[PDB]
User: Fold this.
Amino acid sequence: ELTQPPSVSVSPGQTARITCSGAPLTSRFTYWYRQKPGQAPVLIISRSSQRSSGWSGRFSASWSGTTVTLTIRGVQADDEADYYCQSSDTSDSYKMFGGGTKLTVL
Amino acid sequence: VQLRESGPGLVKPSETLSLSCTVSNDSRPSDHSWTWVRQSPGKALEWIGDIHYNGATTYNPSLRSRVRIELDQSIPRFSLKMTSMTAADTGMYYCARNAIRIYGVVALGEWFHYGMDVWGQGTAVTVSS
Amino acid sequence: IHLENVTEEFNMWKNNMVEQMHEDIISLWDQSLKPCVKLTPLCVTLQCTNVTN
Ligand SMILES: *[C@@H]1O[C@H](CO)[C@@H](O[C@@H]2O[C@H](CO)[C@@H](O[C@@H]3O[C@H](CO[C@H]4O[C@H](CO[C@H]5O[C@H](CO)[C@@H](O)[C@H](O)[C@@H]5O[C@H]5O[C@H](CO)[C@@H](O)[C@H](O)[C@@H]5O)[C@@H](O)[C@H](O[C@H]5O[C@H](CO)[C@@H](O)[C@H](O)[C@@H]5O)[C@@H]4O)[C@@H](O)[C@H](O[C@H]4O[C@H](CO)[C@@H](O)[C@H](O)[C@@H]4O[C@H]4O[C@H](CO)[C@@H](O)[C@H](O)[C@@H]4O[C@H]4O[C@H](CO)[C@@H](O)[C@H](O)[C@@H]4O)[C@@H]3O)[C@H](O)[C@H]2NC(C)=O)[C@H](O)[C@H]1NC(C)=O
Ligand SMILES: *[C@@H]1O[C@H](CO)[C@@H](O[C@@H]2O[C@H](CO)[C@@H](O[C@@H]3O[C@H](CO)[C@@H](O)[C@H](O[C@H]4O[C@H](CO)[C@@H](O)[C@H](O)[C@@H]4O[C@H]4O[C@H](CO)[C@@H](O)[C@H](O)[C@@H]4O[C@H]4O[C@H](CO)[C@@H](O)[C@H](O)[C@@H]4O)[C@@H]3O)[C@H](O)[C@H]2NC(C)=O)[C@H](O)[C@H]1NC(C)=O
Ligand SMILES: *[C@@H]1O[C@H](CO)[C@@H](O)[C@H](O)[C@H]1NC(C)=O
Ligand SMILES: *[C@@H]1O[C@H](CO)[C@@H](O)[C@H](O)[C@H]1NC(C)=O
Assistant:
């Protein structure tokens, strides 16, 4: 499956980073979502064509080994939610989710 | 693009499940993917299955023995057939559109998933008596 | 010039027209290959990776 930190604490204004780890992340592509409590998930990082870094706007992500770092630039107090990395298997048969990671804002 | 779910609210245990999700304001409804994903309270998300308008479906293999997803395309509303409801499946369930864009021949796999852009209403799936 | 009633049997499997035609083009296409660049310094220790994305 996937591997995440359970919760990440940071003050506003700094740069919070979340490391989604897992065995399928050797090869496959990683999603990202945002879900407010009591409401729907929101796709936050999608992808373009393959050699195009997906998309770089307000967030970014790098890759090193089986770890994928979720860079959050410019933390404020309004983005408080729970976050999720998503991928599939290298065999391309089924789709799994991350464990879930709470944003803790000071 | 609009979407709305459809649910009964209260379901007894050991019975079945009939859900659907109606889609409107979609200029190309025919070339996306359509999926059910559920959520338990205070838990992670939980993918269920998916359907494409060719008729090809995949499922979560652990849940595969009790589920089925089917489709009407005239009314852009795809259904949901879960059997054998248990109280552990009490949660918040979602329909969603997983978009795919095309960079060439569809039959040769020159496409990629855009990502799941549009998320459903959510329904308080209550398995109780 | 159309001819009147000549019973003649062919043999498409045994003629030298096919044999010459195979010999012509190989010699002709090799003739175009002569003044071009030789270009054999590149047979060296090439090292690569996958295209990064
Ligand atoms: C052998 O036979 C084969 C047939 O079996 C044949 O295969 C065919 O090959 C060709 C090419 O090889 C394939 O053509 C591709 O088709 C793609 C899809 O095109 C369809 O979809 C678009 C999208 O329309 C959406 O939006 C409008 C509103 O604007 C709606 O009205 C639509 O209904 C639809 O809406 C849905 O999607 C929305 C967005 O998610 C949803 O929100 C919504 O709910 C809807 O559901 C349609 O518009 C197309 O119809 C016509 O319209 C456009 C308008 O300009 C015309 O230009 C077009 O030609 C159509 O006539 C069509 O139905 C295209 O995406 C793809 O084009 C991309 O690549 C080319 C070349 O690179 C680019 O020039 C082009 O600009 C596109 O590039 C963009 O997108 C790609 C995404 O991968 C990026 O890589 C690229 O960087 C660029 O991205 C940028 O723009 C994006 C959007 O603009 C943006 O999101 C990005 O972030 C970025 O900014 C290409 O044309 C064709 O599908 C094959 N068919 C099959 C069946 O396989 C083969 O060729 C034959 N071979 C031989 C030798 O004969
Ligand atoms: C000689 O020719 C004959 C006929 O001309 C050939 O026989 C045919 O062979 C076909 C493939 O070998 C076979 O098609 C399959 O049939 C089943 C049941 O009918 C169907 O489910 C299959 O559809 C899957 O596979 C195709 C291609 O792989 C996919 O395009 C399709 O979407 C389905 O794949 C999905 O499920 C897979 C399950 O493991 C996933 O791995 C896969 O990634 C994919 O998931 C994606 O697509 C889903 C749909 O969009 C989506 O929900 C999901 O999220 C992913 O995005 C396929 O149609 C024919 O049944 C068979 N016909 C007969 C009569 O036997 C024969 O092979 C040729 N001979 C030789 C030796 O090759
Ligand atoms: C992705 O790669 C492209 C070219 O390979 C590069 O220009 C871009 O800065 C990279 N983006 C990230 C976020 O690493
Ligand atoms: C559908 O929704 C879009 C926004 O995504 C809106 O601009 C458009 O007016 C709507 N279409 C109709 C026919 O109302």
Q: What stands out?
A: Chain C touches chain A through three residues (CB under 8 Å). Residues A 53, 56, 60; C 52 surround 2-acetamido-2-deoxy-beta-D-glucopyranose (ligand 3) (CB under 6 Å).
